[PDB]
Amino acid sequence: GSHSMRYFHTSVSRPGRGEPRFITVGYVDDTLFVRFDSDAASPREEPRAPWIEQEGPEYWDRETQICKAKAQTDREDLRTLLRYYNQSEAGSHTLQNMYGCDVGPDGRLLRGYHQDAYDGKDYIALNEDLSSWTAADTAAQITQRKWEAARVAEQLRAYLEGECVEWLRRYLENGKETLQRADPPKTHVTHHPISDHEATLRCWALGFYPAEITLTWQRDGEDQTQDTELVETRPAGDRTFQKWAAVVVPSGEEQRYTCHVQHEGLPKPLTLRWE
């Protein structure tokens, strides 16, 4: 199918407790493959997937250098943002950045991304054209002017259309055993009476990869969107994900309810009932 590569970065200041903590992780689809933590013993970018371990020491040296340089620029950027928002040096603040690319089944670029948030809020984002910016407020407009004058967007476009796609394609090949295998969900329905008059039906999906999935309950064929309790898809810790959806049903009406499961690993959507 389609695939994505993403690098995530978070710097969190801590006045009076040293310099900001910087953590960055890289993902292909829902698979973590590299990490870096500024508070680690001897910080270096570390592998987290077997198919990246074959990259040579030159690759790890350059990656670690980039990570350390990003930690430093984040520290400078956090100081700048205090000025832009007329804020005190007393408080903890957060700078987040994500960048990456999406490619289709053919390996063609579908789109690229580069975006930032300050204190959990949109700050500035590269537009899908990879040539213009969306600034969230008048502070980000200052960054926009600076990045326009420095032709940052042109540099990002070159990366996102070139190395981003090329190295994602490389990683997909080297890790094809896992990155190009979809594990379908194992599914079942559980029943828990609440009362003499009502019962909970819970539709379970376990052990699936990638994380994207749709679980829906129908009553007499009608989606129960409004009355369905849907928990966030969650990691099992073995690369796979879990999710459930629950409805409250009148006692005796259980057979009118059907759970429908859609997942890339399934050739056809599944329909399940309480047995």
Binding site: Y7, G26, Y59, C67, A69, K70, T73, L156, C164
Partner: peptide, 6 residues
Amino acid sequence: KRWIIL
């Protein structure tokens, strides 16, 4: 492979 803000 990462990009570096030049």
